[PDB]
């Protein structure tokens, strides 16, 4: 008996209700209040220039055609009811492929208050586009955006607002960071307007600010390249009479740089300009190359001009270590101070 | 007021036969297209295709959907599209495509008082384009997008671009990591299959690859090793342990470059313009080592003649490598 009372209320609301028409058609602009709870911020892909984010996307609006009076004030209904009524067609402008989870049931909620206000939330895994500028790789920072708005309703019909103050409307869970090489510093919440070829639409935007962690590249690429360059300059201390020693020493370090330069290329995304690591490796490739060219000059003058042969070898013990020191002062101050 | 609009929409959908195209048996129904490209990415040489995301709009006039007394453009819920007639437009070279469906199926239905219908879908497709990579990486491609009607012939449906050359926008905002869009072209024509003549619309871009990426990792590492092998000519010819150690290691170093570069580069199993260059550099380091062995065989019998080979090898090898580059670079550029 008591249960059937709510059945009659649900039947009455849908009787003479058309879901093809937004509330207040031809009279007023529908206001949809939106806020987001980011459950977890997924991995960021450098090669695909994308990222993943899981949100509790919440929307709210007012419909005068669903007003009712009864024993209860809030109808904690099921998602089976949602398809019967009108819901905003919110989509993500820069989304690549998003999933609306439905295990074990459609992850959607619908609550109707007595005055007609609706709350409609859902769980999503959005994969968005984040164009990047890798001119400072690996010491780079990015601001990945997330833009959503209506698809078919222009700003003369549907306008979007944040539920609370914009800063405190996109809440990120404390244990919601799946980043392993980035560092989510913070996010900013803003609003805008776009002009397509059909009309003016309202766009809600959120930017997440990241900053890559360079600890992995120091122990894997920067240090081995420094030691290999340092190792090649050791050849300036072996006496000139040991021709097989310095030639084997000189040429293997070129092979070591090639082996190191190949592996470091795998982590680099495919771009068409010079990154900050490409400048360092290319410069470190020049020092191991010039060390071997230097020995040939020293060996050529040996046994015919001994005085000059030592002079070249004596100066090179200073110039080569000094220049590499100057390079590591200009380089590490240019990129670390941006 | 609002209840009157429900009556108007109910009147239109009542008796509307979805199985009949507009003007069935009369003049063909003209459909106009707009494309607002959102992004282009994943231009892959391994699979010879590309991924294209766009806003695809179609316009046609239906007399059955005319209404009066409502001075508005009724943007209806997108699920009313299942109760209307829409063209069976499809992409001929489409390998995999889908209409985005978050948070709802990305689709727009807008009606006008005179019966005109605007129908927009947000589609992400993966169209195929054959690539002539024989000049890789100094190559130029032409990847297209073919739009055609499937079940209706030129007697029933017509296609055209809406606005002319302005029908496709958003190309200027596209930037690719490895390519640069040079020009896009719109073509309208007919294709005659075995079941009739079908209207066709074509959208074709022309991509020219960026060149500065391969200089750092592909051509410069191979050139520097080749120059290193020439150091062997300024070493005394009796230093057998030194010239051989330098001579053979460069071959190993050049081999190490090719095998790992072969993996990084896309698997394109036929001869390109980069394989010819790399093999060109592998011969020079090969001949440098083979040149010493001739010197080492005769440096004891004829020391004076052996020194002559060294002096000339310091000139012939640099001259020929620069000559090889001159023929190569002009041939492919």
């Amino acid at each position, epitope marked *: 008996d008591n249960t059937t009372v709510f059945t009659r209320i649900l039947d009455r609301l849908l009787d003479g209700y058309d879901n093809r028409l937004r509330p207040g058609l031809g009279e007023r602009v529908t206001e949809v209040k939106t806020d987001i709870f980011v459950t977890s911020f997924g991995p960021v892909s450098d090669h695909d220039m994308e990222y993943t984010i899981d949100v509790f996307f919440r929307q709210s609006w007012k419909d005068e055609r669903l007003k009712f009076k009864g024993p209860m004030t809030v109808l904690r209904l099921n998602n089976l009811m949602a398809s019967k009524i009108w819901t905003p067609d919110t989509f993500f402008h*820069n989304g690549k492929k998003s999933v609306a989870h439905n295990m074990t049931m459609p992850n959607k909620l619908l609550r109707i208050t007595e005055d007609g206000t609706l709350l409609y939330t859902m769980r999503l895994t959005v994969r968005a586009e984040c164009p990047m500028h890798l001119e400072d790789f690996p010491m780079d920072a*990015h601001a990945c955006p997330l833009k959503f708005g209506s698809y078919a309703y222009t700003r003369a019909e549907v306008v979007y607002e944040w539920t609370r103050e914009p800063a405190r409307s996109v809440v990120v869970a404390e244990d919601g960071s799946r980043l392993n090489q980035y560092d989510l510093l913070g996010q900013t919440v803003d609003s805008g307007i776009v002009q397509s070829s059909t009309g003016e639409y309202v766009v809600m935007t959120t930017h997440f600010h990241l900053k890559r962690k360079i600890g992995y590249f120091v122990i894997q690429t920067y240090l081995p390249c420094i030691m290999t360059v340092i190792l090649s300059q050791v050849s300036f201390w072996l006496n000139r009479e040991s021709v097989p020693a310095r030639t084997v020493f000189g040429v293997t370090t070129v092979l070591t740089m090639t082996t190191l330069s190949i592996s470091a290329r795998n982590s680099l995304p495919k771009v068409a300009y010079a990154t900050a690591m490409d400048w360092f490796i290319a410069v470190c490739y020049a020092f191991v190359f010039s060390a071997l060219i230097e020995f040939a000059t020293v060996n050529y003058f040996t046994k015919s001009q001994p005085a000059r042969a030592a002079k070249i070898d004596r100066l090179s013990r200073i110039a080569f270590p000094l220049l590499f020191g100057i390079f590591n002062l200009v380089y590490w101050a240019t990129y670390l101070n941006r | 007021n609002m209840s009157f609009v429900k009556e108007t929409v109910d009147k239109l959908l009542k008796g509307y036969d979805i199985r009949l195209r507009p003007d069935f048996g009369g003049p063909p129904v003209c459909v106009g297209m707009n494309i607002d490209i959102a992004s282009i990415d994943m231009v892959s040489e391994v699979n010879m295709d590309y991924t294209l995301t766009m806003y695809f709009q179609q316009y046609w006039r239906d007399k059955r959907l005319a209404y009066s007394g409502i001075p508005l453009n009724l943007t209806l819920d997108n699920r009313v599209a299942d109760q209307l007639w829409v063209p069976d437009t499809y992409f001929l070279n489409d390998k995999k495509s889908f209409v985005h469906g978050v948070t709802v199926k990305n689709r727009m239905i807008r009606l006008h008082p005179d019966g005109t219908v605007l129908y927009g879908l947000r589609i992400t497709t993966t169209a195929a384009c054959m690539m002539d990579l024989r000049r890789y990486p100094l190559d130029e491609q032409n990847c297209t997008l073919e739009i055609e009607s499937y079940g209706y012939t030129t007697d029933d449906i017509e296609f055209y671009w809406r606005g002319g050359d302005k029908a496709v926008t958003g190309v200027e*905002r596209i930037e690719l990591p490895q390519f640069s869009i040079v020009e896009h072209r719109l073509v309208s024509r007919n294709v005659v299959f075995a079941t009739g003549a079908y209207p066709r619309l074509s959208l074709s871009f022309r991509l020219k690859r960026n060149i500065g990426y391969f200089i750092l990792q592909t051509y410069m590492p191979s050139i520097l090793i080749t120059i290193l092998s020439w150091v062997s000519f300024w070493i005394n010819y009796d230093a057998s342990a030194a010239r051989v150690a330098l001579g053979i290691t460069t071959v190993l170093t050049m081999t190490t470059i090719n095998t790992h570069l072969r993996e990084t580069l896309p698997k394109i199993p036929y001869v390109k313009a980069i394989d010819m260059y790399l093999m060109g550099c592998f011969v020079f380091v090969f001949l440098a080592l083979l040149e010493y062995a001739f010197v080492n065989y005769i440096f004891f019998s004829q020391p004076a003649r052996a020194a002559a080979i060294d002096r000339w090898s310091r000139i012939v090898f640099p001259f020929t490598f620069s000559l090889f580059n001159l023929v190569y670079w002009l041939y492919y550029v």
Partner: nanobody
Amino acid sequence: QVQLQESGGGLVQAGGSLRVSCAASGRTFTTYIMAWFRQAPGKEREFLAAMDQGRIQYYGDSVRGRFTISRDYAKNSVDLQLDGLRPEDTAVYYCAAGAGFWGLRTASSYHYWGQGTQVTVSS
């Protein structure tokens, strides 16, 4: 070197259109955010409008509904359409481009800047 050259400006009679343009050279700003900033004499530098790669348009509170920003991606230029100019608008307008790190409304997030364009409104 990247140069942000501006144009436009002048004197107006307490209203009327005055389109102020900008021009960029040396680097393509297709993937960057190009914005317009205003610096009243002695007060501060103030954000007016911006437009990123997706044609999303942001404005300020005191300039919404009056100033319109447009970008010509082919010519690497950004224009600001000034309408209904008020005497309080007398200031120096700047052209900026950046990646929008730590917010696109902050003047410290743009690595490039124009040379300014004086616009004076007579009451």
